[PDB]
Amino acid sequence: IYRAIVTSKFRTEKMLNFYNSIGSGPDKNTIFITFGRSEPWSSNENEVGFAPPYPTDSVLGVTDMWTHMMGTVKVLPSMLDAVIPRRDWGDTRYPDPYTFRINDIVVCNSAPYNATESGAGWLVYRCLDVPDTGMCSIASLTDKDECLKLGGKWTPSARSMTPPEGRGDAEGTIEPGDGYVWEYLFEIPPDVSINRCTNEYIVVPWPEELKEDPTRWGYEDNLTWQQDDFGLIYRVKANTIRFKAYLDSVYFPEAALPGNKGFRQISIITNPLEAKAHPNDPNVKAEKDYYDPEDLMRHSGEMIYMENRPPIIMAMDQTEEINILFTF
Amino acid sequence: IYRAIVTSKFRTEKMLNFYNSIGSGPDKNTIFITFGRSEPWSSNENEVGFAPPYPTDSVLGVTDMWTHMMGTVKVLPSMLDAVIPRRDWGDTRYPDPYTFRINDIVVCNSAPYNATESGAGWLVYRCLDVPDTGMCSIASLTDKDECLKLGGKWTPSARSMTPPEGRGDAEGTIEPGDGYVWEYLFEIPPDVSINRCTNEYIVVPWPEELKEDPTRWGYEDNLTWQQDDFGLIYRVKANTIRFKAYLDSVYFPEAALPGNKGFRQISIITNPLEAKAHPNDPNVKAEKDYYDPEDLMRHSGEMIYMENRPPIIMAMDQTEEINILFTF
Ligand SMILES: [Br-]
Ligand SMILES: [Br-]
Ligand SMILES: [Br-]
Ligand SMILES: [Br-]
Ligand SMILES: [Br-]
Ligand SMILES: [Br-]
Ligand SMILES: [Br-]
Ligand SMILES: [Br-]
Ligand SMILES: [Br-]
Ligand SMILES: [Br-]
Ligand SMILES: [Br-]
Ligand SMILES: [Br-]
Ligand SMILES: [Br-]
Ligand SMILES: [Br-]
Ligand SMILES: [Br-]
Ligand SMILES: [Br-]
Ligand SMILES: [Br-]
Ligand SMILES: [Br-]
Ligand SMILES: [Br-]
Ligand SMILES: [Br-]
Ligand SMILES: [Br-]
Known part of the structure; x- marks a missing residue:
């Protein structure tokens, strides 16, 4: 019951x-x-x-x-x-290089087609919203929120015409305009990328290591700590x-x-x-x-x-x- | 790979x-x-x-x-x-009340059909061995050890005549005679079997409380502590x-x-x-x-x-x- x-x-x-x-x-x-x-x-x-x-x-x-x-x-x-499936914005060496899905954690600034702010390591962003038209995985329900009253795994039609850049607004929200929406999460350090990351996975710092050295992970300008308390691993479905x-x-x-x-x-x-x-x-x-x-x-x-x-x-x-x- | x-x-x-x-x-x-x-x-x-x-x-x-x-x-x-599925020996109000399988965890002394000793809580035995003759998951496997090494769980055709009683040998082995080996695990105090347990779930002590006070859980005679270190929840696959x-x-x-x-x-x-x-x-x-x-x-x-x-x-x-x- x-x-x-x-x-x-x-x-x-x-x-x-x-x-x-x-x-x-x-x-x-x-x-x-x-x-x-x-x-x-x-x-x-x-x-x-x-x-x-x-x-x-x-x-x-x-x-x-x-x-x-x-x-x-x-x-x-x-x-x-703690690691999560690595997905570089535009890596045609794999499926759907430009079309993503909500809550998909995408990496940027790791390649020429990611380049958005040299000098910084990989920047990781989360996909908040996607383009209207598309497929709802199960059943039909399509439009502005037809598959958003229940919210089922939704794969869009139009592609991401461009990578998100910077650390978004106070909440890291970025609107590329291609009908997508991203949230700036953090920045992986060169050594971590080189030593800990792979083609399949990237690293997500732990709450502790995040709270001790924020700037190291591009987590300082972040305010969602006043809420999640360095709970990034939580924000990206890391398991x-x-x-x-x-x-x-x-x-x-x-x-x-x-x-x-x-x-x-x-x-x-x-x-x-x-x-x-x-x-x-x-x-x-x-x-x-x-x-x-x-x-x-x-x-x-x-x-x-x-x-x-x-x-x-x-x-x-x-x-x-x-x-x-x-x-x- | x-x-x-x-x-x-x-x-x-x-x-x-x-x-x-x-x-x-x-x-x-x-x-x-x-x-x-x-x-x-x-x-x-x-x-x-x-x-x-x-x-x-x-x-x-x-x-x-x-x-x-x-x-x-x-x-x-x-x-x-920590709770595990509850399976009472003899509960003829359910399926296989006299027929068990390897590693099944049975409970005795929790009702008339279980009664083995007034003055003791529920006694939880683990099925170690069962009648050679029987049936198998895969029909074409009319052999214990065969169905034993091929995976499928073997279901003994000979029922358990009497419920296992006492604490058994060195490791806790017990043989009534119906060709059904059993291993005493531990016991459950009334205050627990009455407030904590349910029809389909019996409580299993946590390591520390099993340590804090052994005899209480009928884990006194136990010798496995010299290795498993009160890791009972591990032995019964409690998750x-x-x-x-x-x-x-x-x-x-x-x-x-x-x-x-x-x-x-x-x-x-x-x-x-x-x-x-x-x-x-x-x-x-x-x-x-x-x-x-x-x-x-x-x-x-x-x-x-x-x-x-x-x-x-x-x-x-x-x-x-x-x-x-x-x-x-
Ligand atoms: Br219910
Ligand atoms: Br694509
Ligand atoms: Br969500
Ligand atoms: Br290293
Ligand atoms: Br931590
Ligand atoms: Br840590
Ligand atoms: Br350590
Ligand atoms: Br360490
Ligand atoms: Br508040
Ligand atoms: Br949430
Ligand atoms: Br039976
Ligand atoms: Br086993
Ligand atoms: Br009864
Ligand atoms: Br209680
Ligand atoms: Br632990
Ligand atoms: Br414990
Ligand atoms: Br407590
Ligand atoms: Br405890
Ligand atoms: Br030793
Ligand atoms: Br084992
Ligand atoms: Br399991």
């Missing part, structure tokens, strides 16, 4: 609680990324389009993971980035965390030996405990940065994510980058 | 994130439950089978929600409960939280008088702010236990949940139990 819904702001909430929960202390969580394996999938595993087996969400799956674990890397917050962990082979010389067939498994384990002598002892939370699986209480903590992929070669003191996408 | 996924523990992990993120300070959350709208949805709202319209997950939705907010109550941890809160008219005189209109909207705002004298005044995260909407800065916080229902009359000195489900 009751009609309820979890609003998308809940998807962001989860993502935030998770990111905030991480910390040192018994009151906090420590997550460890893990790698391991050697037993090659099959012969034809180095082929192109080769899909290894999915990981088995089961205790046998978990143990089959812990058995092949070769080492562990503590994941700190500075390695987690995805992209990791960025480097495997320091310099740590372990175990597989940094010539041959090596690399590992094919990855897993994120939360709150694993340090191997105890007398099993009837007080469990200890693992808070160091690295660990030898044997130095870790097998099965301790919770395994929230397992990954299977082709083998990855590791050298002497060669640095290997690990990235994963958690969604909420 | 890669073959990876999130395991069941990830969901539990999210629920725990939510529950633990609540409190004071900036890295924690203050959740309020709002109740509002006195004006009828329509003249037929009091008619049986009447459902109002689904709320709209849009800024308009929130503005509207606020437009009609009558009051808001702070949500305390003691009000949230749902149930809200138990009370709306006292006494604190909202306005909204109540000998003849009011009631309230038809409930929603949840995380981290709202109190009213400001002026827009630039630093943001004052609202922590009081209850607010009149006017005392809160409109649109502050993040509305992660909305819900509309027929009117609920809020007479003088009468409290209303407001329940809310959250799935992660």
Whole structure:
């Protein structure tokens, strides 16, 4: 008899609680990324389009993971980035380069066809309104607000004749005139773009990092903080965390030996405990940065994510980058 | 390209994130439950089978929600409960009352058909093994282990003769004889099974309260604490939280008088702010236990949940139990 819904702001909430929960202390969580394996999938595993087996969400799956674990890397917050699907205004290398949709977060000033204010990093804007005529996804209802009395995912006809520029009005509202409307959100720093961003995704700072260094993210001229309190991740429907962990082979010389067939498994384990002598002892939370699986209480903590992929070669003191996408 | 996924523990992990993120300070959350709208949805709202319209997950939705907010109550941890689907052994008022599957969580000792021990609350066992002979999701798979390794859930053709009793062996194993293995999990105190549980949901203690006082949850003999660290919610794949809160008219005189209109909207705002004298005044995260909407800065916080229902009359000195489900 009751009609309820979890609003998308809940998807962001989860993502935030998770990111905030991480910390040192018994009151906090420590997550460890893990790698391991050697037993090659099959012969034809180095082929192109080769899909290894999915990981088995089961205790046998978990143990089959812990058995092949070769080492562990503590994941700190500075390695987690709230990210959203990247969409550059006019990138014809993908679909609909000029036609968008309401609430679509579009990036600008990242390419010659984005160039709007050199010297600044990528500027990200939100699409508030679009051109009248178009399609309402479901049913029909089309005109000035025919699909705006209910507001269903609406794809317009006419295109964006031009990228929005600057930081809009006090509320970042910009009216290009092409029948579109945008809201200036923020500015991504060069290094962040270079180091953290990708072709698929961009980074959204966290409320905290935003409140501490506003100008850094082109968030200073912003007043919507008097309302959202640095809740940008909320404003752009961010609900995805992209990791960025480097495997320091310099740590372990175990597989940094010539041959090596690399590992094919990855897993994120939360709150694993340090191997105890007398099993009837007080469990200890693992808070160091690295660990030898044997130095870790097998099965301790919770395994929230397992990954299977082709083998990855590791050298002497060669640095290997690990990235994963958690969604909420 | 890669073959990876999130395991069941990830969901539990999210629920725990939510529950633990609540409190004071900036890295924690203050959740309020709002109740509002006195004006009828329509003249037929009091008619049986009447459902109002689904709320709209849009800024308009929130503005509207606020437009009609009558009051808001702070949500305390003691009000949230990790709950899992409830399946009572023997409840012949439902399907498979004697036929279970692997990993099913059954409840015994919660009614005559369950009775196993006066002097103990509900005992929640987990089905570990079942009769070899039976049927399978995919017909062409007339074999346990076959259907076991092929995915499909196996349904034993031989029913469970008697309900599992006691706490079992070392890890909690129990074998009546009907070729149905069981694993005792924990127990549920009356004060909880009576106020917290429902027909389809049984409460499961959170780690800290399982720690704070074990024997209470029949988790005393337990040894898994030497590894899972009171992570019971993980073992049962608990990802749902149930809200138990009370709306006292006494604190909202306005909204109540000998003849009011009631309230038809409930929603949840995380981290709202109190009213400001002026827009630039630093943001004052609202922590009081209850607010009149006017005392809160409109649109502050993040509305992660909305819900509309027929009117609920809020007479003088009468409290209303407001329940809310959250799935992660
Ligand atoms: Br109902
Ligand atoms: Br830390
Ligand atoms: Br399992
Ligand atoms: Br597990
Ligand atoms: Br850090
Ligand atoms: Br286009
Ligand atoms: Br970096
Ligand atoms: Br933050
Ligand atoms: Br931060
Ligand atoms: Br150990
Ligand atoms: Br699940
Ligand atoms: Br947590
Ligand atoms: Br909206
Ligand atoms: Br909103
Ligand atoms: Br409490
Ligand atoms: Br049956
Ligand atoms: Br009965
Ligand atoms: Br109670
Ligand atoms: Br807890
Ligand atoms: Br607790
Ligand atoms: Br205000």
